[PDB]
From a paper:
Predominantly expressed in immune cells, homomeric [name] receptors are molecular sensors for pathological inflammatory states by detecting and responding to mid-micromolar to low-millimolar local concentrations of eATP. [name] activation triggers signaling cascades that result in up-regulation of the NLRP3 (NOD-, LRR-, and pyrin domain–containing protein 3) inflammasome and activation of apoptotic pathways.
The structure of [name]-bound rP2X7 reveals the noncompetitive nature of this ligand, in contrast to previous data. Shallow binders, represented by [name], A839977, AZD9056, and GSK1482160, extend minimally into the classical allosteric ligand-binding site. (A) Shallow binder [name] occupies a shallow position in the classical allosteric ligand-binding site. Following a 40-s exposure to an IC100 of antagonist, channel activity recovered more with exposure to AZD9056 and [name] (82 ± 5% and 81 ± 5% of baseline current, respectively) when compared with exposure to A839977 and GSK1482160 (67 ± 6% and 69 ± 4% of baseline current, respectively).
Residue numbers in the entry:
A (entry chain A), B (entry chain C), C (entry chain B): 6 to 74, 81 to 442, 472 to 595
């Protein structure tokens, strides 16, 4: 059993000294290797990739001046006037505003927005919580002004919801504002961390696509016009702008490159439906107390919400990933073998010689694939009990009968023809008749009727001379000296006496005839002797007082 | 060397015309292919998958009315009264509040919360910064009211921290509020971008699981009751609700489907410990100046923080991914070969014939696997110096002796028995004695004692007639004419004279005996001639004035 | 065709009973299996991994006392005084502040910051929107104080932008503040969800690296000092701290482990350039009305923004992933075959015997690889029309001539020498002359001149006796009886009469000579008979009234 452990199985191979096959094999191997390497390096499949974790710190610089109205009001807007305390992944810059000062919780006519005019008390319902007007209707219709009327609502009054944003936008100068974005990114699995601002960067820089791609100071107007967006128009109703920071980071020492790439993308739909809150704005309430009453100043602030979208992956060499990829791609190196073996398989077919080659003379010298096929493959059939082989001296090939003999004589069964092997020339270089019979020497079988059809076989398919009449038949089969020599070869001390040697000689004669007429031991083992030859052999070496068993399934 | 480059190696194969083996092979191949294809299409393993980057814009609509108290106060709450300016991935809706107006930074008794009652000055420490009371203790105990006492703290007074949230929740009507969620998602690697609102969507829609799964307008109460949550109860102490937007996006043109799926999940633990801040609330300070003093109004706002969780992947066909997957799965197509080869290997074993087949007659016709095994495999042993083969005319097989001859005669060494090859019938179809000896013709070896055991071998294991006595021995071995014919065959012009031809004849006789009794040249090359036969051969073709070398390791 | 479907191809193999090869094979298989299993379990390659979606709820506890100034002001700071309403992935804690109360929109001298002193009106431009001073310059120079001057700007006055943060930080006590972080994480694909606080956790716990790694209550000072950061120093100008919550979650039931790991990392660059806004701060405006004027209190709040970075993956067993990994690694099990086959290939080379073995006697017994190579591989050359084989009785090997015969006699073409196969001993164990000629029996070819060089071949390369003179030549080639026996063997009933049998005998003699002198039918099929032997054969079996075709390309 240890010897069994100590075994190695190696495949038998046929080395072909073919220029075309070698060329094809090497070309296919080179192609597979080149593609595998290109995929490995282009996609960095040898690298474990980890998503980043990002922190964003934004600082907006800029000052705006507004002059509006009934008295003229001159206002200055600094960061605390147009920015919220948040300075993370999103920062808001106010670009326009509607101000409703001195609101009190009381009854008032709703602002006439979106054709909300009232003509009669039936145009509104009492106690209806209108989120559009942002009040609760009292059910009555009251005059908003001299010309139009609007229902009364309990809300923050004077109610002005629905009024249009100023145009032009009051804080247009925000296009000239700048934002400094500090982005700290980390790959914890790879234990790496960097930031978008490194020592040596000039502080007077402003971002540009080509001149200053790494400058993290962005002018808002430049952001808008880089992607063909009009800051002046968006400033009226507001919008959402995304600043994308892509980190395609290679953390390998020999190829270390972890630098941010900045892009811009409008995130709010320019063509948003009017009822779906187009643009970007929010209502902020400044609460105070005046005249012993709780009052509220409502600022509808329109502006651009800048969303900093930080994304990317960090790739670092990982042996497991490379091993997995190489293992996945290893099977592709069998492409050359598959292709060349398929070529040999298909071109060895006889169909190519009869039809393709005469039509196409260029594909003619590819007939060598038959020699390759025969030096590569050994066909064998299942040695089933019904397997029989018959050879007729008239015919030049052997016939296989794999079907059950249902009474019909073996002579009448057609079967499938198979080629006759070439008896090694090297070894051969040395010095009333039954109705089915056609030679006149066959005799009825002595077997039981149920299996008598097996022995109902003649040496030929058409009438003619019996094969037994040939002197070579006597030399190979009936020659007692030759059979005795063969027996001695196998059994040097065999006793050439007794009824036993005669049975041994009979079996040796059967084997000799089968090998001579079938060549291969595969066919000879399942060959069926003709009745004439079988009975002549038995006459030469008969059985004293027994009945012949006949062919035996060797399996 | 170029010829070497121009080589192709093809495996030698044995084609078996077996119905069962072909059936098994094709069934296994179909199963492997079906599973590989199913995995490829189900998991989209041909697609490169990229995580999305999302931007969320939320707009809350809704109006609430509150009537509380000592004077009756009728208050209206619109978006600016219950929402914060943030409208991104999270939005907060106030559902309840505790108001402490007119706070001044001074000394006051802490609110009696969680059994914080005071009975003596020793129940509290001076200068202790109590974050629960949100003040610094003065070390003294003072009467909070007529019945209970509480220590004095320097804080915003009147201190009311620890008071219970109103019940029912004041802003219960928030269940009727609606939120419009605009979700812009982008796959930058795939250069794709879409949003959850497309042209044609009805604006009066409200989200529903089945009727309106794509409507991005959600009623908060509907959100809560979709997952079996009670908005009325959560509104008292607040909570956190997550609106999950899953983007399972297929970006292939032939299978393009990038649509959001909305789900809801409570994010705050319903059973949070009382000391771990159950629910959701925050304290907001409204600062003002009254009576020449800095005053503060503290609003403890309880509400639902809605967290919009946007996640998903975009898959687009990538040739590299498909190639990698196919390469990974290619090796599985060898399953049929592995299984059928294992069947042939195991069923060819003799163990199955002796035990399994007699017990199980159904597994009997599988004995054909032995023929397959012998047509597929050629066993060979290592040709080591100790390798020897011995054949005894008494025994029917050959014996291998691979162990060193440590003085013990080769006759006495047992070794391991091996089968005798069938001499090709096709080629064969033509026309005082030593103590270890058992034939009476062996003679002591003339070799040095150290290696004399090699030649101490007899033609038989038991007493009997010598193999040399057989006439076939003389015909094959001693026949000078046959050996001369063989020599001429190899060397046509060999000069049949001189002491050289005699040595050539002796070696040819050795080879002839070895081939006759061992058949294979593998065994004959390492076979050991019996002393009797060896010395008879030497007598026929002796050496004039030299000592015989004897067997030579051929390796 | 169905029989074709019912076929199975199995590779022919040579089983080697070698201890070293078996050892190498099993060692390599064990190594490959061990590494594959280690990679599978270490990297959980059998698991589908899904990124988490996280929700963070933060609650800060802590109270601070400040005493500053011209009148002494004693202020208390609770959560509503130093925290913003946001309680999600980021929370801000105020640690220092600069307060500018009672600002009015009017003209004032800018604060003298960063050497902004003015000496003349030419040092500033009118209408210049200075974002540093946060005002619009009027173009005039005015005295900020008695000693220094600064230009006039329309801004919120008194302008104090650029004033240094207080030192020490006013809210130093914030180091003693605590934050409770509730983290709800979910894997939607795996349909799993958990949180960082589970029942049974003690509420008096405070986080520690070793003692309380799972306590989600963190002291800010402890956070800073865990990573060697000084909270007192950072509190002056502020900063950004990241609380990383890593979820390495295994969702398999047998290996379920989904627990958070807390780490800390400073996110703001300690060495940020002075002009790049070092630290963290924001300007918040408190608007009010005083004396009938809109006034503003500007608080420059410096503090630590704590960013909770939640990341991780959830791994759950997936059959497809395991199948893909196993398929990727299957090809690696062919390493043993590749290595051992390469060893056999290289050590069988003759180059190793001539040079390596004499120099290195240790690598000598590896000569057995030649026997393995010959039992494993069968070399065959392409049977092209130019393929010819010639054997000279003088030389001991055969010669291959694969080049076109451009008039030059085949005798003069060198070609490449090839070894002579061993004629199976088993089958052989039985009983004026042309200028190019060197035997005296060759005759000029009768073929057309263009192809006459093919037959211009002699039996030897040097002068000597003709091979035809040997009696074995007559026995094998000229023996009519032997050729007739061979013909009968193939055709038992062949009629031994007529001009046909003579041509059959001539062809059989050609084959017999080719097989005798070339052994293999591969070489014999393309062998070229010497002119002497060819013409002697023709003399024995001549053609009556025709011209001999001569050698025919068998392909
Ligand atoms: N191949 C082959 N073998 C045969 C044939 N007939 C008989 N045998 C073999 O010869 C043996 C029977 O010998 P036979 O003379 O017919 O009957 P016996 O006297 O009882 O031995 C069996 O083991 C068969 O394998 C035949 O036609 N073809
Ligand atoms: N297989 C085999 N070969 C042998 C045996 N004895 C001798 N030889 C071969 O014969 C050669 C020696 O011939 P031998 O007559 O014994 O001595 P010599 O006169 O010096 O040549 C060696 O090369 C051996 O390979 C044997 O028992 N078995
Ligand atoms: N291998 C080999 N075959 C030959 C040679 N010469 C002739 N033949 C074969 O013999 C056949 C021609 O016979 P030949 O006596 O030369 O002329 P024929 O009388 O017209 O048949 C062809 O089919 C050749 O394949 C030779 O030198 N070598
Ligand atoms: Cl959106 C925003 C961002 C930052 C600050 C403010 C602030 N809040 N109260 N008054 N605001 C200032 C202000 C004045 C005049 C017109 N518009 C806005 C807002 Cl409203
Ligand atoms: Cl949480 C929140 C969201 C939005 C606005 C407010 C606002 N802030 N100052 N007063 N608030 C209004 C208000 C009045 C009465 C009771 N509760 C709250 C808060 Cl507090
Ligand atoms: Cl950053 C921040 C966080 C929370 C609250 C506040 C609040 N806003 N108006 N006054 N503030 C309080 C206050 C008083 C005195 C000194 N500093 C700050 C701020 Cl400013
Ligand atoms: C931005 O600045 C430039 C130059 O300072 C000025 O011409 C332009 O009008 C400014 N934009 C706005 C919207 O005021
Ligand atoms: C990660 O990198 C830092 C800096 O190089 C190093 O100090 C640390 O040991 C590394 N490994 C960790 C943090 O596990
Ligand atoms: C941008 O929008 C403004 C409206 O505010 C308009 O006057 C201007 O012409 C627009 N610019 C372009 C380039 O369309
Ligand atoms: C929500 O609206 C319905 C119908 O308008 C009303 O019956 C219900 O009371 C409202 N819910 C609350 C909490 O007020
Ligand atoms: C991405 O898509 C847009 C729109 O189809 C196209 O204009 C652009 O060229 C594409 N490639 C990019 C942005 O690299
Ligand atoms: C929801 O909670 C409220 C308490 O505010 C309670 O009155 C009501 O019955 C609850 N509803 C359900 C269905 O449990
Ligand atoms: C934090 O608390 C400890 C003990 O209560 C105290 O000694 C220390 O001074 C405090 N830190 C600050 C900055 O006040
Ligand atoms: C997910 O898990 C929950 C809880 O175990 C279960 O009720 C549900 O059916 C699962 N599948 C889903 C939500 O698709
Ligand atoms: C931390 O910084 C403060 C300055 O506010 C300094 O006094 C103290 O010595 C520093 N601590 C250490 C350990 O460096
Ligand atoms: Na593979
Ligand atoms: Zn007959
Ligand atoms: Zn017959
Ligand atoms: Zn003996
Ligand atoms: Zn003997
Ligand atoms: Zn000659
Ligand atoms: Zn000659």
């Amino acid at each position: 059993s240890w010897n069994d452990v100590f075994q190695y199985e190696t495949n038998k191979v046929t080395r072909i000294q073919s220029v075309n096959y070698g060329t094809i094999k090497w070309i296919l191997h080179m192609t597979v290797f080149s593609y595998v390497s290109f995929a490995l390096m282009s996609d960095k499949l040898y690298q474990r990739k980890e998503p980043l974790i990002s922190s964003v710190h934004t600082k907006v610089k800029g000052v705006a001046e507004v002059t509006e109205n009934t008295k003229l009001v001159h206002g200055i807007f600094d960061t605390a006037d147009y920015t919220l305390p948040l300075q993370g992944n999103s920062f808001f810059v106010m670009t326009n505003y509607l101000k409703s000062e001195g609101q009190e919780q009381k009854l008032c006519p709703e602002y006439p927005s979106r054709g909300k005019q009232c003509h009669s008390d039936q145009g509104c319902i009492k106690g209806w919580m209108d989120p559009q007007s942002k009040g609760i209707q009292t059910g009555r219709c009251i005059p908003y002004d001299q010309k139009r009327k609007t229902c009364e609502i309990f809300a923050w009054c004077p109610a002005e919801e629905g009024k249009e944003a100023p145009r032009p936008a009051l804080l247009r100068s925000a296009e000239n504002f700048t934002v400094l974005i500090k982005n700290n990114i980390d790959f914890p699995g790879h234990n790496y961390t960097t930031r978008n601002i490194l020592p040596g960067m000039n502080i007077s820089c402003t971002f540009h696509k080509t001149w200053n791609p790494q400058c993290p100071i962005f002018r808002l107007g430049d952001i808008f016009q880089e992607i063909g967006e009009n800051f002046t128009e968006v400033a009226v109703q507001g919008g959402i702008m995304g600043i994308e920071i892509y980190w395609d980071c290679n953390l390998d020492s020999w190829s270390h490159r972890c630098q941010p790439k900045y892009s811009f993308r409008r995130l709010d739909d320019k063509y948003t439906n009017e009822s779906l809150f187009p643009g970007y704005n929010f209502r902020y309430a400044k609460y105070y107390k005046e005249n012993g009453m709780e009052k509220r100043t409502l600022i509808k602030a329109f502006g651009v919400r800048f969303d900093i979208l930080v994304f990317g992956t960090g790739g670092k060499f990982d042996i497991i990933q490379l091993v997995v990829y190489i293992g996945s791609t290893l099977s592709y190196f069998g492409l050359a073998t598959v292709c060349i073996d398929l070529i040999i398989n298909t071109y060895a077919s006889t169909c190519c010689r009869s039809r393709v080659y005469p039509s196409c003379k260029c594909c003619e010298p590819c007939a060598v694939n038959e020699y390759y096929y025969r030096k590569k493959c050994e066909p064998i059939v299942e040695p089933k009990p019904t397997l029989k082989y018959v050879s007729f001296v008239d015919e030049p090939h052997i016939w296989m009968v794999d079907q059950q003999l249902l009474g019909k004589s073996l002579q009448d069964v057609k079967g499938q023809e198979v080629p006759r092997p070439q008896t090694d020339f090297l070894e051969l270089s040395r010095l009333d008749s039954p109705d089915w019979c056609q030679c006149g020497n066959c005799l009825p079988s002595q077997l039981p009727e149920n299996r008598r059809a097996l022995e109902e076989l003649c040496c030929r398919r058409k009438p003619g001379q019996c094969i037994t009449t040939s002197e070579l038949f006597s030399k190979i089969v009936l020659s007692r000296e030759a059979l005795q020599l063969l027996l001695l070869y196998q059994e040097p001390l065999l006793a050439l006496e007794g009824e036993a040697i005669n049975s041994k000689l009979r079996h040796c004669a059967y084997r000799s005839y089968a090998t001579w007429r079938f060549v291969s031991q595969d066919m000879a083992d399942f060959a069926i002797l003709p009745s004439c030859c079988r009975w002549k052999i038995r006459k030469e070496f008969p059985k004293t007082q027994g009945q012949y068993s006949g062919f035996k399934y060797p399996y």
